[PDB]
Amino acid sequence: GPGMAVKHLIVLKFKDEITEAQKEEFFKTYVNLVNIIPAMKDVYWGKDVTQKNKEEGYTHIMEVTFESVETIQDYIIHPAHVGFGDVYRSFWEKLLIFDYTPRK
Template sequence: MEEAKGVVKHILLAKFKDETTPEKIEQLIKGYANLVNIIPPMKAFHWGKDVSIENLHQGFTHVFESTFESIEGVAEYISHPAHVEFADLFLASLDKVIVFDYKPTVVRF
């Protein structure tokens, strides 16, 4: 196994507040996705809704994954004014959140 050089994945699991409308969620997702165009170390963004049949989601409904060039890139992202402004809006709409950063490991057989 080898660790991907420099790359860091930033995972955010979200449960939106009950009063957050689908339209508001869509608007927030578009705003989140747009950060990849504004913050240089953010290299990719993916998101999705829970579709698991195991029912182990603990109320979390959405996952957001961002890819960064390095741990330093994550730090730059977190302090970037565009992220700070967006995070204030985004977090205000959430009931629960988990954030996890990791360096992917590639398994070779």
């Protein structure tokens, strides 16, 4: 329906070499993409506190909220894009990205 959210779920394990300062700057830059990418409306992230899957090693979760029925290609080609961009794609040891519309 109109105004339904399209969400991207970014699931991350950082490489051991990545510093706490670097991680902080990474998330700061990602949240600021809301002001740069028109269709991007919100970014929220956090650190897993449970560690229920330590063998899979993922530690961080980032939720990106986009407007539906709008192009997001400017995000895809953005230098800061976590998977595709030159700036940060070397930061992660492991990375999953999902694309879903939340419903109930």
